C-alpha cells in the first residue's frame, strides 16, 4: 500500500528543554531523535548524549510509539562521534561542571535493550563514535551522499566493544579489521555492498523512504518484534542477551492462565493447581 507508506508525515515537536537535540513524534507512531549540532558535524558532547538518553527513554515508555529514528540535523552529517573539543585528559569528555564522561556507552546499551526497532537515518557523515551509533541501530537507511568510517587509530581512540565485535557481525572479520586499521572513508555504495547499511536512497527521498520502512514495521506485531530483537542480540551478548530473551518469555508467561494461576494461588493463600494445564510435548 504505497499510498499509506508514502503518505505525508506530520511531526509534532517534543523538544522542550533540550539544547543539543530535537525530539519529534509522528501521529502514526514514529519518534525521531535528531542530533542538532551541525556546526561540529553533529558530534556529541556529554549533554548531547544525556539528552538522547532521555529522549529514547521517553520513546520507550510512550505506548503510542512503535519505532524510533535517530538522525543528525542537516544534510552534511549524521554524527561525527565524540566532541574532541571537550575531550579531557583524565578519562573522558568534560561537561560544564568538569566531570569526565563516557556516557555514549549508556546510550549504546539503551539502543540495544530498546524493545522497539531503532533506525539510523544517515545523511552525509557517520564517522567514528557516530559510526558506531548507526551500527547499533537495528537498521540503517543511507542517503546516496552518506559517508561511513572509523577514525580511532588516527585520533587516539578506539571502540573495542560493540564498535568492534558487533561490526564484525555485520560486515565480517576481514572488512572489520580494514575499517578499523586503515580508517578510510566509504561511500554509500561501498557500505551497501559490504552489508553495513540496509539500503541506499537519493538524499531527497531519505525521510520519505525511512518513514516507509518504519511504517512497514508499525504494521507488524510489536511483541514479535521485541522478541526477535532480543533473540538477535542474544547471538552476541551472552547472559545479557539471555536476560532480554528470557525476560520477554516471562512477560508472555505472565499473560497465560498457567502463569496467572501461580499468582492467584499466592494471593488467595492456597496451593497452586497446575493440573488443569496440559503438558505440551
Amino acid at each position: 500500500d504505497e499510498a499509506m507508506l508514502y503518505a505525508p508525515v506530520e511531526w509534532h515537536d517534543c523538544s522542550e528543554g533540550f539544547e543539543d537535540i530535537r525530539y519529534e513524534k509522528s501521529t502514526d507512531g514514529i519518534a525521531k531523535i535528531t542530533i542538532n549540532r551541525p556546526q561540529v558535524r553533529n558530534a556529541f558532547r556529554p549533554l548531547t548524549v544525556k539528552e538522547m538518553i532521555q529522549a529514547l527513554a521517553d520513546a520507550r515508555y510512550d505506548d503510542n510509539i512503535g519505532v524510533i529514528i535517530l538522525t543528525g540535523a542537516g544534510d552534511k552529517a549524521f554524527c561525527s562521534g565524540g566532541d574532541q573539543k571537550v575531550r579531557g585528559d583524565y578519562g573522558g569528555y568534560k561537561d560544564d561542571s568538569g566531570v569526565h564522561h563516557l556516557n555514549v556507552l549508556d546510550f549504546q546499551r539503551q539502543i540495544r535493550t530498546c524493545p522497539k526497532p531503532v533506525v539510523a537515518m544517515v545523511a552525509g557523515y557517520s564517522i567514528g563514535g557516530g559510526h558506531v551509533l548507526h551500527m547499533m541501530c537495528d537498521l540503517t537507511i543511507a542517503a546516496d551522499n552518506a559517508i561511513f568510517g572509523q577514525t580511532g587509530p588516527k585520533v587516539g581512540s578506539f571502540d573495542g566493544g560493540w564498535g568492534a565485535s558487533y561490526m564484525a557481525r555485520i560486515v565480517g572479520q576481514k572488512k572489520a579489521r580494514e575499517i578499523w586499521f586503515l580508517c578510510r572513508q566509504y561511500d554509500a555504495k561501498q557500505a551497501l555492498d559490504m552489508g553495513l547499511v540496509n539500503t541506499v536512497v537519493p538524499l531527497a527521498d531519505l525521510e520519505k523512504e525511512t518513514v516507509r520502512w518504519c511504517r512497514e514495521m508499525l504494521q507488524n506485531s510489536p511483541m514479535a518484534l521485541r522478541c526477535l530483537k532480543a533473540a538477535l542480540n542474544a547471538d552476541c551478548d551472552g547472559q545479557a542477551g539471555l536476560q532480554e530473551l528470557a525476560g520477554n518469555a516471562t512477560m508472555l508467561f505472565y499473560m497465560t492462565e498457567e502463569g496467572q494461576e501461580g499468582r492467584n494461588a499466592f494471593n488467595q493463600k492456597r496451593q497452586p493447581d497446575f493440573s488443569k494445564f496440559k503438558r505440551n510435548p
Copy 2:
C-alpha cells in the same frame, strides 16, 4: 506435605518390547527408565541406548508424565558406560549387524532437550559413559554406596563434549581436570562435597527420596520448569540453547491473543490488526 511426598508409589510396567531396559510409570506422573544389564554393571550396548531413547521419547509425549527417573538395575551399578565387549575397531560399538554406533550421543541430546526434568537415581557405580549420563540428568540423587568417576584415559576413550565442558559447569575446572586426568573413583561424600550430586541418602531410602524429589517438582508449573531447563541449558549450548529457550517463548506467544490475531488474519485472508494490543515498556 511429608505424608504426600513419602506415600507409597505404584509402578505400572511399560516394558513391552524392551530387552536391555525396564520402563515403568507411576499413576502420579513419574516415568522410570531402568538399565537392566546388571551382569555387566549396566553397561550400554547400542540396543540398550536405542531402547532408552524410545522410552524417553514415550515419556516426553505422555502428558501424564512430568518427571523421568533414570537408574540401573540392582544396587551395584547405575551404569558402567559403553559395553567394551562390543566396542569395534571402526569407530564405535558393534550391533549384531556389524554397524558401529556411538548412539549414546543421541541419548545425551535427548535428555538435554527433554522439556521435563530428568533425575539420575544412582546406586553403586556411575562410571565412564555411565558417569556422563548421570551428569547429563538435571539432578542426581545418590545412595551412600554410590561411586563416581571417568575411565577414558585408562580404557582408550574420552568424552570431550558435555562429558568435559558440562562437568566443568558442575564441579569447576580444577576438579574436572582431576576427574578426567587421573581417573580416580570418588565416593558419595566426595561427590556431594564437590557439587557432583544433589544429595546422598542411605541406600535403602534411595527410591523413597528420589520419588520425594520428583513429587516436589510435580507440584510445580510444568511450563515454568521447561522454560528454566532451557534457560539453564542456554548458558552452555549457544545457538542450540537459544533454539530451546526461544522455542518456549514461541509456544507462549502462540497462547496470546496477539499471536493468535496473526494466524486468524492469515486464515481469514485479511490484514492483521495488532494496533489493539498495548505495547509494554
Copy 3:
C-alpha cells in the same frame, strides 16, 4: 568431470507409508526428501514433520547415502512454514488427536546434527518456517524463481532460535534484522547478493545443478565432511557443538592402536600399556 557430474540421475522411490512427503534415493548416494503438500504451498503440519524426521533418520543410517536433498513438490514452493490451518491456541499445531506440536524444532536439530551434508533445493517460495528450513540446510541451491523471507511479525510468530542467530551468521546482523522486522520478500538475486543462498540457476536446471553439487561432495572424504560440519556448528552451538566435534574425535580415537589398547587391556583383564605410542608434540 562434467560428463559424470551431469549424468542422468536414477531415483528409486522409498515413499511407501508416507502421506505428506516423498522420499527417494539415487544409485550413486543421494537421498531426496520432498514435501508433498503443493495445495498449501508445502506448509508442514505435524504429520509432515514426523515423516521428514523418519526419512532423514533413514538416510542417516543408510551407509550408501552420502548427501541429502530437501525440497518441495512442484515449482511454486519449497515450503511456506507451519500450516496455519491447523495451528491451535494452546502453543502449537494440532494433530488429528488434538495434541499441540512444535515438532519442526526436532527436525531443525536433526538436520543440524546429521553427519551428512544436507542441501536445500529451492524452487519458488521458501517462506517463514520454510525459510528457516532452507537456512538450516548446509547449502542452498536456488532457482531463478525462488522467493525468500520471514512472516513471523505479520502472522503472529517468531523463530528466535536458529531462525534468528543462525540467520545472522549467514547474512549479517543488519540484514537479519531487516528480514525479520519488515517481513519483505526477496528474490533469488537479492538472496544470492546477501549470501543467503549458495547459487542461483535457471529453474529448468535446478535438480541438474543440485545433483552436480551433491556429486562433488560424494567424491570427498565422508569423515572429513562430518568433522567439518560439526566444526562449523561448533562456532555457533556452544557445548552442543563441542559434543558434535569431540564426538567425532572419539570416533577417530577408537580407530587408533592407542585407543584400542585401552579397550584390549580392559577386555583382557590387564593394565594398559601406552608406552609403545610415541607422544607427538
Copy 4:
C-alpha cells in the same frame, strides 16, 4: 587494621522524595540502598524499583562513594521479590497509572554495569526476584538467620536470564537446577556451603561485618576494581561484557600521551605523530 575496619559507621540520609526505599551515605564512601516495605517482606512494586534505580544512579555519579550496599529494612527480609498484589495479567506489574512493568530487569543491568562494587547485606528472606537481586550483587554478606530460594515454578514465574545462567556460574549447574526446579528454602549454612554467599555472620554483626568488607574494598584502586568487575562480567555477557571491558580500556587510553596526541592533532588540524611512542612487544 581492625580498629579502622570496625570503627562505628555514621549514616547520613539522602532519601528525599523516596516512598518505598531509604537511601543513605556513610562519611567514608559507602552508599546504602534499603528496600523499605517490611510489611510485605520488602517485595518490590514498580515504584520501588524505579526508586532503587534512581538511588543507584546517584551512587554511581557520586565520586565520594566507592561501594554500594543493597539491603532490606528489618531483620525478617532482604526482599521477597515482585509484589504479587500488583502483578497484572498483561505481562507485568501495574503502577498507579495502569502501566505493566518488568523494570527489575533495568535494575539488574544497572547493578551489573555499575563500576563500583555492590554488596548484598542479607538478613532473613532473600526469595524469588529478591534472591536474583542478591545474586546480581558482586558479593553477599549473610546473617545467620538468612534464608534463600526461588519460587517461580510455584508462583507462576521464572527468571531465565541472569537468574538462571548467572546462578549456575555461582553454584554450578546441578545446584542451580535443584534450586529452580524444587523451589526449596536454603538456610545460611546451606548457602555458604554451595558458594551462594561469601560469608555468614551472626545477625547482630551483619552491618559491622558488611561495613568491614566495604572498607577493605575502599582501600583499593577504584580503577582496578572497575576493570576487574567488567572482566568478570565479560566471562558471562559476550559482547555486552566486551563493551564494559573495552570501555575501560578506552578510558585508560585517553589518559595516555599517545591517545592525547591523537586528540590534539585533530583539534590542531594537523597529522598526528605517533612515531615518538615506542612500540611495546
Copy 5:
C-alpha cells in the same frame, strides 16, 4: 598522500640462517616474510613453519616494525598448505629426524596474538593450510591472478579450528560450508565478492598496493591498533580473547598515575593512597 604511499620501498635482507623462507625489513617499518619453496607451490614443511615462527617473533620484538607482510615467492603461489610429500602416518608432518609435527597450529596462534597487523599478500594459489594462513592474517590484498580454496575433504584432512569457525566469521556460514564441503577453487573476483579478501589489484601492482595499505596503518596509533586487533579477536576466542584484550588494558593501566601509585607504595613499603584519583562515572 599518494606520493608518500606509493614511494619506493627500501628492503633490507634479514634471511641469514633461513633455508625455506626469506625475511626482509623496510626502513619505514614493514617486515616481510616470504615462503620460498616455489617448486612445491610454497607448501610448508615443519622447518618452514619453524622459520616463519622465528621471523614473526623477530618482527614482534623489533620496535621499528609496525606491520608484517606474509607472502609467497614468485607469482604462482602464496602457499599450497602442508607439504604432502612429508606428511606421515603418525598424526603429522615428519621432520628430518622423524618427529611428526602440526606446528602450523603454533604459527596460527602467533599471527592471532601478534600486536601488529599482519597482511597476506596473495599472488596465485592460496590453498588448503595456505588458505587458512591468509584468512588468519588481519587483511588480505589479492592479485587479480589469485586463486582461493580448501582441499581437506579431497586430500584427507580438515582444519576444524580457525580454518572453519573463523572462515565463517569472514564469509558467512553458507559460503563456509560450500568452500569446505565441495573444495572448489575461487578466483579473485569471487573472493572479493564474498568478503574473503579486502581488495583485488593488478598482479604487477600487488606489492605497491600492499605497501600502500601498510603505510596507511603505519600512520596510525600502534596502541589503538593492538587494542582493536585484540577486541576483534575477543569476539571469537572466548577467554583467550579476553586475555589479549584485558592484557592491553593492564598495559595501559601501568602507564597511569593510579596504577603506578600501587607499585610505588609496594616498593616504598608503605600503604597505597588511591584517594587522590577521582572516580569516574
Copy 6:
C-alpha cells in the same frame, strides 16, 4: 600400586644456561620447572618468564616427558607474581636493555596449549601473577603452609584475562569477585574448600604426593589426556579452544586409512577413492 606411586624420584639437572630457574627431568617422565628467586619470594622478571617458556617448550618436545611440575624454590613461596622492582612506567617490566614486557601472557598461553598436563606444586605464597600461574596449571597440589590470593587492586594491577574469567570457572563468580575485590589471603584449607586447589598435604609430603599424582597420569593415554585438556579449554576459549580440539581431531584423522588415502592419492597423482571406507551413522 602405592609402591610404584611412592617410589623414590631421581631428578636429573637440565638447568644449564638458566639464571632464574631450575629445570630437571625424572627418569620416569616428569619435567620440573622451579622458579629460583627465593630472595624476592620467587617473583618473576622478564628473564625469568623467558626461561620458563624455554623450559616448557623443551618439556613439550621431549617425547620422554608426560607431565610437567611448576614450582618455586624453597618452602616460603611458589611465586609472588611480577617483580615490582623492575616494573616500569611504560606498560610493562623492564629488562636490562630497557624494553618493557608483559611476557607472562605468553607463558600463560603456553601452559594452556601444552598437550601434557601441568601441575602446580605450591609451598607457601602463591600470590598475584603467581596466583594466576597456579590457576593456569591443570592441577594444583598444595602444602598445608600454602597461601593464596590476588593483590592487583592494592598494588596497581589486574589480570582481567584468564586471571579473572578462568578463576570464576574454578571457584565461581561470588568467590572470584571476593578474591579480586578485597585482596585477602587464603590458607590451604580455604583454598581446598572453595575448589581452588585439588588437594592439601603436609609440607614434608608435598613433592612425594605431587609425584604420585603425576605418575597416576603417566599411566594413562597421552592422546586421551591431550584431547581432554583441549576439550576442557574449549569450554572457555571459544575459537582458540576449537583450534586445539579440532587440531587433535586432525592428528587422529591423519592416523586413519581414510585420511591417509587422501594423502596417497595426491602423492600418486590420482583421484582418491574413499568408497572403501564405510559411512558410520
